[PDB]
Design an enzyme around this catalytic site. Structure first.
Site, PDB file in Angstrom:
ATOM      1  N   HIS A  69      -8.710 -48.706 -52.209  1.00 48.81           N
ATOM      2  CA  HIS A  69     -10.184 -48.780 -52.434  1.00 48.81           C
ATOM      3  C   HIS A  69     -10.582 -49.869 -53.455  1.00 48.81           C
ATOM      4  CE1 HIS A  69      -9.240 -44.260 -52.026  1.00 48.81           C
ATOM      5  NE2 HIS A  69      -9.381 -44.738 -50.804  1.00 48.81           N
ATOM      6  N   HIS A 123     -19.507 -52.279 -61.333  1.00 47.70           N
ATOM      7  CA  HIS A 123     -20.071 -50.968 -61.594  1.00 47.70           C
ATOM      8  C   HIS A 123     -19.448 -50.401 -62.856  1.00 47.70           C
ATOM      9  CE1 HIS A 123     -20.982 -50.273 -57.068  1.00 47.70           C
ATOM     10  NE2 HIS A 123     -21.948 -50.984 -57.658  1.00 47.70           N
ATOM     11  N   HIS A 151     -16.586 -54.341 -56.353  1.00 46.11           N
ATOM     12  CA  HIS A 151     -16.607 -54.247 -54.896  1.00 46.11           C
ATOM     13  C   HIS A 151     -16.742 -55.740 -54.567  1.00 46.11           C
ATOM     14  CE1 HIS A 151     -17.411 -49.854 -54.786  1.00 46.11           C
ATOM     15  NE2 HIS A 151     -18.060 -50.050 -55.913  1.00 46.11           N
ATOM     16  N   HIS A 168     -15.348 -50.866 -62.247  1.00 45.53           N
ATOM     17  CA  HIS A 168     -14.634 -51.411 -61.093  1.00 45.53           C
ATOM     18  C   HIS A 168     -15.553 -52.394 -60.384  1.00 45.53           C
ATOM     19  CE1 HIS A 168     -17.039 -48.020 -59.583  1.00 45.53           C
ATOM     20  NE2 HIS A 168     -17.290 -48.818 -58.562  1.00 45.53           N
ATOM     21  N   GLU A 172     -22.714 -54.343 -52.985  1.00 46.83           N
ATOM     22  CA  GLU A 172     -23.131 -53.136 -52.288  1.00 46.83           C
ATOM     23  C   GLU A 172     -24.665 -53.166 -52.207  1.00 46.83           C
ATOM     24  OE1 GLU A 172     -20.736 -49.801 -54.154  1.00 46.83           O
ATOM     25  OE2 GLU A 172     -19.955 -49.997 -52.119  1.00 46.83           O
ATOM     26  N   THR A 179     -21.063 -44.454 -54.214  1.00 52.61           N
ATOM     27  CA  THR A 179     -21.023 -45.217 -52.973  1.00 52.61           C
ATOM     28  C   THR A 179     -19.717 -45.028 -52.194  1.00 52.61           C
ATOM     29  OG1 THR A 179     -20.187 -47.244 -53.997  1.00 52.61           O
ATOM     30  CG2 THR A 179     -22.614 -46.945 -53.935  1.00 52.61           C
TER      31      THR A 179
END
Ligand SMILES: NS(=O)(=O)c1ccc(C(=O)NCc2ccc(F)cc2F)cc1
Ligand SMILES: NS(=O)(=O)c1ccc(C(=O)NCc2ccc(F)cc2F)cc1
Ligand SMILES: [Hg+2]
Length: 258
Positions: A62, A117, A94, A92, A104, A196
């Site tokens: 992930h 985030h 994305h 973290h 996101e 999310t």
């Protein structure tokens, strides 16, 4: 099997195991700057990260999380649309396979290269486990990353990625200062939402900063060399670990600036 971002277990499949995926306050969402309501009563954000104690960095499949010691009010977020003190527990990113995608949240349908985030939990609940069971349990500070100049403060993170290339790997990561990842301005948009990624709990007050930070192409490239898989398994590059924008439904995005 377990959830992911692939064709067979990606976001479009999460609803089967996590019905909340089709909930009323799911994230991320598209921020339409022309319909976001400027709210004069919104207080300025108070980010106190001077006593932040980072402890470890890990690849959990992930994404990669940098964890902090949240045993005391060392790194906290207050102000803004928040009531009470929220402790930083981890941050973290994305990101995408290409510079044109990765974030996101989107702004007027524009996707950025990545999104940071910074996750905090409401201290009134005692522990994060209780916090996720409340409508105001978490506060996530979202920051967009666009490709341009290198971000000095991000390099320490980039250099360590090699030691946590595969799922389950972790490395000691002490003395990292999260203040190095903040943009100049703290102007933001805010709306009630959710995590999310599964379990997709609707316990988050989202605070998305207007000003993105810039990172070099070389820095973003290194995120892309991480693996979703564990050691000794077929290599799947960790890219495009983002959930597409969800319907806003009956929510209003508020802006702290005009
Ligand atoms: N104080 S520390 O640095 O060791 C620490 C760091 C990260 C995490 C974490 O990412 N767990 C997430 C998590 C675990 C359980 C849950 F219910 C919700 C949730 F977000 C937990 C503790
Ligand atoms: N991209 S994002 O900011 O929305 C995001 C932030 C934190 C987490 C997390 O801590 N996952 C672990 C976790 C594990 C168990 C649980 F019940 C809840 C939970 F969040 C997931 C997504
Ligand atoms: Hg909740």
């Amino acid at each position: 099997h377990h959830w992911g971002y692939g064709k067979h277990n990606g976001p479009e499949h999460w609803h089967k195991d996590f019905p909340i995926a089709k909930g009323e306050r799911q994230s991320p969402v598209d921020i339409d700057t022309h319909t976001a309501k400027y709210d004069p009563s919104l207080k300025p954000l108070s980010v106190s990260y001077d006593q932040a104690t980072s402890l470890r960095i890990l690849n959990n499949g992930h994404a990669f999380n940098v964890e902090f010691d949240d045993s005391q009010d060392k790194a906290v977020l207050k102000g803004g649309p928040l009531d009470g003190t929220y402790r930083l527990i981890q941050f973290h990113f994305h990101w995408g396979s290409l510079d044109g995608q990765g974030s996101e949240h989107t702004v007027d349908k524009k996707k950025y290269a990545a999104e940071l985030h910074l996750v905090h939990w409401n201290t009134k609940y005692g522990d994060v486990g209780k916090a996720v069971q409340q409508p105001d349990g978490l506060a996530v500070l979202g920051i967009f990353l666009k490709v341009g100049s290198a971000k000095p403060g991000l390099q320490k993170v980039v250099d360590v990625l090699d030691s946590i290339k595969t799922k389950g790997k972790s490395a000691d990561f002490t003395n990292f200062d999260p203040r190095g990842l903040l943009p100049e301005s703290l102007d933001y948009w805010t709306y009630p939402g959710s995590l999310t990624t599964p379990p997709l709990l609707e316990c988050v007050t989202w605070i998305v900063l207007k000003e993105p930070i810039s990172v070099s192409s070389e820095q973003v490239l290194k995120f892309r060399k991480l693996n979703f898989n564990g050691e000794g398994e077929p290599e799947e590059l960790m890219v495009d670990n983002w959930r597409p924008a969800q319907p806003l439904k009956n929510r209003q995005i508020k802006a702290s600036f005009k």
